[PDB]
Amino acid sequence: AEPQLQRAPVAQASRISGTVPGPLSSNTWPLHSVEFLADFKRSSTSADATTYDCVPFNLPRVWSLARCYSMWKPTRWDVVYLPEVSATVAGSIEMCFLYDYADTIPRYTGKMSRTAGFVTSSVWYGAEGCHLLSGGSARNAVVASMDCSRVGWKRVTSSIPSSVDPNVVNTILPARLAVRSSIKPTVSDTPGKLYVIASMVLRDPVDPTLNT
Amino acid sequence: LSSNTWPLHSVEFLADFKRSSTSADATTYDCVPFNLPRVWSLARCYSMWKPTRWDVVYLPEVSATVAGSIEMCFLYDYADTIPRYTGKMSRTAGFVTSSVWYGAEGCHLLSGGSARNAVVASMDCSRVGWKRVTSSIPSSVDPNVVNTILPARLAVRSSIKPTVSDTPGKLYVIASMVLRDPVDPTLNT
Amino acid sequence: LSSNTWPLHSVEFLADFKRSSTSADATTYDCVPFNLPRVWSLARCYSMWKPTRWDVVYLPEVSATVAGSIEMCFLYDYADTIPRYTGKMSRTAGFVTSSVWYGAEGCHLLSGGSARNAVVASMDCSRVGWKRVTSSIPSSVDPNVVNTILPARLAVRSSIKPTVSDTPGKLYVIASMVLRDPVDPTLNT
Amino acid sequence: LSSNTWPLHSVEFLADFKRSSTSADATTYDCVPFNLPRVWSLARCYSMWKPTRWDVVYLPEVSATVAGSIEMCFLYDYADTIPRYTGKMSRTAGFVTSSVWYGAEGCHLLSGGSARNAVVASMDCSRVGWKRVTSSIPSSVDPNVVNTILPARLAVRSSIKPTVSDTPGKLYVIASMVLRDPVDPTLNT
Amino acid sequence: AEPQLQRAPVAQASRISGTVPGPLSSNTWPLHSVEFLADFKRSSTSADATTYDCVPFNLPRVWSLARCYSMWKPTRWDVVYLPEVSATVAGSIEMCFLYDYADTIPRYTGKMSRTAGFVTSSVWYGAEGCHLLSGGSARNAVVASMDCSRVGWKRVTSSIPSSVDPNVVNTILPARLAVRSSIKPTVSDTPGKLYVIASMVLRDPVDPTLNT
Numbered sequence: 001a002e003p004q005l006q007r008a009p010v011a012q013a014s015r016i017s018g019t020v021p022g023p024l025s026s027n028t029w030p031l032h033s034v035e036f037l038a039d040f041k042r043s044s045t046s047a048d049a050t051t052y053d054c055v056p057f058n059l060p061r062v063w064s065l066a067r068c069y070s071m072w073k074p075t076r077w078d079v080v081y082l083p084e085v086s087a088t089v090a091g092s093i094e095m096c097f098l099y100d101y102a103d104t105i106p107r108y109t110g111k112m113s114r115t116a117g118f119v120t121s122s123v124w125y126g127a128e129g130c131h132l133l134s135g136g137s138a139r140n141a142v143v144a145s146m147d148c149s150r151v152g153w154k155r156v157t158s159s160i161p162s163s164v165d166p167n168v169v170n171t172i173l174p175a176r177l178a179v180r181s182s183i184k185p186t187v188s189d190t191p192g193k194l195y196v197i198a199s200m201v202l203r204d205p206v207d208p209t210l211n212t
Numbered sequence: 213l214s215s216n217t218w219p220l221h222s223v224e225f226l227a228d229f230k231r232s233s234t235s236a237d238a239t240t241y242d243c244v245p246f247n248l249p250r251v252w253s254l255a256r257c258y259s260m261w262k263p264t265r266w267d268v269v270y271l272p273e274v275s276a277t278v279a280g281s282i283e284m285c286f287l288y289d290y291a292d293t294i295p296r297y298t299g300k301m302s303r304t305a306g307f308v309t310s311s312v313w314y315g316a317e318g319c320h321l322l323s324g325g326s327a328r329n330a331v332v333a334s335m336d337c338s339r340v341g342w343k344r345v346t347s348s349i350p351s352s353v354d355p356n357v358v359n360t361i362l363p364a365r366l367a368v369r370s371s372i373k374p375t376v377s378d379t380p381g382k383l384y385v386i387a388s389m390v391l392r393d394p395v396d397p398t399l400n401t
Numbered sequence: 402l403s404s405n406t407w408p409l410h411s412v413e414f415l416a417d418f419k420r421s422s423t424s425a426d427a428t429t430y431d432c433v434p435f436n437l438p439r440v441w442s443l444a445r446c447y448s449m450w451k452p453t454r455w456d457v458v459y460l461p462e463v464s465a466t467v468a469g470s471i472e473m474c475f476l477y478d479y480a481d482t483i484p485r486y487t488g489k490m491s492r493t494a495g496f497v498t499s500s501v502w503y504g505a506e507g508c509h510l511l512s513g514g515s516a517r518n519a520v521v522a523s524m525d526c527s528r529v530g531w532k533r534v535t536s537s538i539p540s541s542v543d544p545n546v547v548n549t550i551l552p553a554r555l556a557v558r559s560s561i562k563p564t565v566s567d568t569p570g571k572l573y574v575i576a577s578m579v580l581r582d583p584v585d586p587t588l589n590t
Numbered sequence: 591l592s593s594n595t596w597p598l599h600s601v602e603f604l605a606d607f608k609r610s611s612t613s614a615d616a617t618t619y620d621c622v623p624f625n626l627p628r629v630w631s632l633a634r635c636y637s638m639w640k641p642t643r644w645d646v647v648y649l650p651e652v653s654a655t656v657a658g659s660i661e662m663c664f665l666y667d668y669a670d671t672i673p674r675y676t677g678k679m680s681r682t683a684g685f686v687t688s689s690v691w692y693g694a695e696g697c698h699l700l701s702g703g704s705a706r707n708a709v710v711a712s713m714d715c716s717r718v719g720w721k722r723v724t725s726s727i728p729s730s731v732d733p734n735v736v737n738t739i740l741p742a743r744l745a746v747r748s749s750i751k752p753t754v755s756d757t758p759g760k761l762y763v764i765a766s767m768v769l770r771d772p773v774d775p776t777l778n779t
Numbered sequence: 780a781e782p783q784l785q786r787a788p789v790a791q792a793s794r795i796s797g798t799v800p801g802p803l804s805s806n807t808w809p810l811h812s813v814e815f816l817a818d819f820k821r822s823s824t825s826a827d828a829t830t831y832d833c834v835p836f837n838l839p840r841v842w843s844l845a846r847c848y849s850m851w852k853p854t855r856w857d858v859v860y861l862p863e864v865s866a867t868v869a870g871s872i873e874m875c876f877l878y879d880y881a882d883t884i885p886r887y888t889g890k891m892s893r894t895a896g897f898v899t900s901s902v903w904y905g906a907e908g909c910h911l912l913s914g915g916s917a918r919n920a921v922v923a924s925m926d927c928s929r930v931g932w933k934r935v936t937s938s939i940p941s942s943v944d945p946n947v948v949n950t951i952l953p954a955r956l957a958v959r960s961s962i963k964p965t966v967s968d969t970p971g972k973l974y975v976i977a978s979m980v981l982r983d984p985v986d987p988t989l990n991t
């Protein structure tokens with residue numbers, strides 16, 4: 001055919017609309033995952049509960065994805081206790097959630113029981129929780145569920161301002177998981193494992209390297 | 213109805229309406245559970261609260277000859293300046309004013325309803341979210357930090373400087389809220 | 402509708418799109434009423450505001466041969482670092498880039514609105530709650546405190562460094578919001 | 591609802607009811623946005639306004655022993671002579687009169703409704719067209735020129751000459767209007 | 780009914796088989812994405828081409844996901860040039876790929892043309908490449924495609940051993956993109972942008988924090 005006589009424009013707009021396509025470019029992105037939280041450490045001297053900040057950057061794998069978004073909203077967050085001790089082991093594991101950073105960490109059973117999301121279990125009970133981490137059946141699992149309803153959209157951070165008014169911390173920290181041992185062993189030990197079954201929604205992308 | 217949630221309707225004395233003989237500034241009251249002993253005793257057992265009502269009624273107890281009036285309004289931003297005069301009060305949310313000796317008819321508001329002849333200052337509670345219950349306020353902090361725990365402040369002012377400081381009536385709070393996540397009363401801050 | 406809630410749709414010049422001949426950093430604009438003189442005149446009369454739209458359209462006014470592009474995106478966390486380059490921009494929310502000379506078709510967005518071949522950067526307003534109207538930003542504080550008042554920041558970047566500092570266009574904001582509890586404009590901070 | 595139009599409901603302190611110890615003449619107040627600081631701050635952002643409500647409530651703050659009463663009426667023509675006495679006031683539009691110490695019951699009118707025992711002077715707003723918003727009034731001009739910008743004047747009078755000038759109560763404006771064509775607040779005259 | 784008389788076992792095995800469930804737990808995970816590579820910098824003094832290592836850690840968003848896997852295999856890797864200059868701009872952009880770290884970087888057109896994946900374009904041609912980044916239509920785009928067939932499974936790294944024998948570098952570096960300017964402007968400038976349209980397969984998960 002005839003060679004086409006192209007008309008050359010002074011320019012030609014180069015335009016892109018919206019976050020460049022890829023795995024985490026959608027306005028929002030829902031994510032469900034099982035994440036090892038920590039060892040159930042049993043102090044032999046302290047009766048104080050151990051605290052765990054329920055925020056994305058504390059979940060290595062989830063964090064990898066979460067740092068690509070600026071906002072997140074927890075939908076599930078459930079911590080399962082997996083026993084790794086015989087049925088001869090005395091003691092109990094106590095768990096509850098603290099929804100205000102300003103609130104004091106429970107130092108004993110009574111305090112723990114009076115706190116939201118409270119749960120206790122024979123340190124050797126709950127192995128069936130292993131099946132929770134995969135399929136389901138929380139029938140015989142030791143789980144501490146965090147109240148996620150009513151939790152709004154939180155900014156995704158890579159840190160927690162700890163030496164700051166608890167009120168500013170609250171703006172980023174939906175809740176803290178408080179884990180306590182009902183008794184003091186003669187020597188520190190680790191009766192089981194704590195795995196988190198988190199479900200959240202990420203929103204509004206951001207270059208990971210900028211996210212803090 | 214359930215699962216970390218139950219409504220609470222209460223009535224409690226808030227404070228005496230004090231008229232300064234020298235200052236024209238408005239007195240400010242933080243609308244949070246810990247400023248109401250009984251309500252506090254309940255709210256402290258929960259981690260989060262959400263005001264559904266919060267109304268402050270002025271009930272007079274002076275002679276029909278006392279001059280001056282009471283002015284009330286709500287401040288929803290800690291950073292906002294406290295009204296120094298009538299015009300300023302009149303321009304802010306929930307503004308209400310009434311002769312200092314009027315308002316006794318609003319006592320049935322304390323039990324029952326009919327705010328028909330009451331002197332009430334209602335706080336805008338719709339669209340007020342869940343706030344963490346606290347045992348105090350960080351007064352030396354950025355107002356924005358305070359706003360996190362303080363839904364609003366009630367600003368009360370006297371339209372007149374009496375010859376001597378005096379209290380013509382009292383303020384009663386009629387609050388209605390919902391509490392959420394259980395917490396040991398002694399550990400609530 | 403009503404009851405301490407006034408809806409508002411405005412259009413205002415936001416700022417000049419400035420291109421630095423030395424810095425590759427983006428310029429950020431705080432998406433809050435006090436940054437728009439006319440809108441501020443209105444918003445300062447209220448304690449609370451809630452953005453419903455907030456769109457910033459770029460209107461060019463340079464030769465079609467000028468080199469470079471304008472890049473825009475929104476930052477929803479004050480803690481988040483300001484983009485220093487195209488990828489950082491292309492990777493974040495509301496990203497949009499267009500040749501610096503392109504855009505005039507966007508004037509229709511201003512009057513009326515038929516955004517087609519318009520260069521707009523829309524902010525995520527859904528799920529943005531009632532914020533407190535302020536007259537400033539506490540930059541000297543924890544970014545989390547700032548977040549309390551800053552729904553988002555618009556990030557505008559020049560895809561390239563002109564040999565001389567210049568401004569090839571202007572940014573106009575098309576905001577839609579609802580205002581809530583009245584305050585004396587002079588006491589609103 | 592839209593395209594250069596949104597309703598505005600406001601409440602603001604208008605002025606102190608001042609009783610002259612020597613003059614029997616009525617004091618006059620121009621019912622225009624610029625005489626209400628906050629409302630002005632809003633209205634000035636628009637070129638045209640149209641009053642939908644405009645009610646002025648008298649709220650007393652004196653002893654039940656003060657004698658005399660307040661008289662109010664509206665004047666819809668700048669050329670019209672200001673009422674010198676009770677009969678004259680009583681014969682003009684919106685006329686209302688009440689003992690100077692009565693009216694506190696009308697405070698709920700400021701927030702909510704029920705003008706049931708209020709002392710309100712309502713301006714006839716139906717059939718009041720769009721008027722240009724102004725920052726002032728040409729007082730030395732033909733009344734007809736003034737009528738162009740002045741929907742009406744509120745005439746307030748004391749049915750008695752107290753021994754000394756005094757202010758028994760205050761006047762609060764409860765205005766409701768619609769604004770129309772945007773304008774830079776600083777350029778509005 | 781009758782209370783069930785539970786039989787208490789000496790223990791109860793706590794077992795989990797396979798990487799804990801979540802977004803990046805599958806043995807393999809395929810990922811396609813558009814990633815801004817860099818500015819097409821035009822030196823006014825050097826004629827040397829600029830090199831870009833075609834490896835995951837150089838793609839911020841992709842890297843977020845890629846660091847959760849230990850092995851990767853490029854399937855596509857295409858670099859698109861987007862012009863941001865008028866049709867009055869003189870010069871050309873030259874691109875090619877170097878598949879051996881030991882190979883010398885081309886210093887001129889002839890050298891560039893003799894190299895695999897070679898491509899040149901009027902610096903003001905190729906705006907239609909914008910549509911490539913989203914839908915498709917590479918009909919009028921300036922693209923430099925990397926030979927991915929025959930590229931095996933490479934270990935995912937967070938760095939490149941640069942002061943090491945090019946042969947060891949080759950074990951981790953599938954290829955380098957060489958970008959050159961056909962001419963020297965009177966002063967350094969940036970005629971356009973380089974975006975990468977990568978496609979790869981990730982395999983064998985690993986805690987991100989361990990991945991280096």
Ligand SMILES: [Ca+2]
Nearest residue numbers: 156211212478
């Ligand atoms: Ca962040």
Ligand SMILES: [Ca+2]
Nearest residue numbers: 100345400401
């Ligand atoms: Ca608390």
Ligand SMILES: [Ca+2]
Nearest residue numbers: 289534535590
């Ligand atoms: Ca304010």
Ligand SMILES: [Ca+2]
Nearest residue numbers: 723724778779
């Ligand atoms: Ca005017």
Ligand SMILES: [Ca+2]
Nearest residue numbers: 935936990991
């Ligand atoms: Ca590795």
